Amino acid sequence: EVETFAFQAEIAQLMSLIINTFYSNKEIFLRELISNSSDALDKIRYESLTDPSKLDSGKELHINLIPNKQDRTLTIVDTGIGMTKADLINNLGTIAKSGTKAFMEALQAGADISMIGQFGVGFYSAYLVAEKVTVITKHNDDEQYAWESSAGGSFTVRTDTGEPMGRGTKVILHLKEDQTEYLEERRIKEIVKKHSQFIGYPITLFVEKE
Numbered sequence: 001e002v003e004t005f006a007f008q009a010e011i012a013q014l015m016s017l018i019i020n021t022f023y024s025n026k027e028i029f030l031r032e033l034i035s036n037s038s039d040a041l042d043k044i045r046y047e048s049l050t051d052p053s054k055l056d057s058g059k060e061l062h063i064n065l066i067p068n069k070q071d072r073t074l075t076i077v078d079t080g081i082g083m084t085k086a087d088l089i090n091n092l093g094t095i096a097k098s099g100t101k102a103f104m105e106a107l108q109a110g111a112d113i114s115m116i117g118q119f120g121v122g123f124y125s126a127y128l129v130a131e132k133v134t135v136i137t138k139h140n141d142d143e144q145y146a147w148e149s150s151a152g153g154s155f156t157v158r159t160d161t162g163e164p165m166g167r168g169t170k171v172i173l174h175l176k177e178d179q180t181e182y183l184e185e186r187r188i189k190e191i192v193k194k195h196s197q198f199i200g201y202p203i204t205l206f207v208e209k210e
């Protein structure tokens with residue numbers, strides 16, 4: 001059972017601006033997604049101080065970067081707090097409406113796409129490099145869900161039947177054909193060192209077996 005939803009109009013306009021604007025500095029997408037993972041890890045770390053049982057679904061707090069040249073995917077996995085169904089369908093998009101409006105005003109005033117994280121809508125920079133994004137997520141208070149979108153104004157949410165995650169979020173970037181540099185180990189290392197060197201959780205870059 002797959003449910004299909006329209007993006008709010010502002011968010012659809014934002015993703016079309018991200019997909020259609022000429023902007024060469026695409027690598028900032030990785031900083032934004034790692035920043036999101038770090039925030040999610042911060043959240044479960046704080047909550048577990050007053051309720052240790054929140055870590056029953058996994059005590060390790062980390063971020064894994066998993067390129068896959070065969071599937072042409074880059075996966076960012078964290079063991080943070082995860083996202084509920086209502087987060088996916090309504091809450092986070094509602095919050096993103098004001099930040100989207102502010103970011104688009106700033107872009108008219110001379111800002112540039114690299115500043116997107118200062119508005120809280122950095123996730124959508126994934127569409128700088130990805131033609132489709134799948135998000136698998138598990139919150140302690142809800143079931144495991146798959147969110148997916150190829151832009152175009154709509155997204156889907158379904159219950160996930162894949163491997164159980166425990167707790168956290170997995171962002172699967174289905175990369176555009178000309179963005180496969182972000183599958184290369186030395187390129188990912190360079191980007192993490194440049195933009196994410198002080199993230200307070202272990203970031204493990206998986207290497208490919210082939």
Ligand SMILES: CN(C(=O)c1cccs1)[C@@H]1C[C@@H]2C=C[C@H]1C2
Nearest residue numbers: 036087088092093123135147169
């Ligand atoms: C995956 N995703 C996130 O990881 C975060 C965005 C902002 C803070 S976390 C989002 C959930 C909903 C589905 C995709 C977007 C909107």
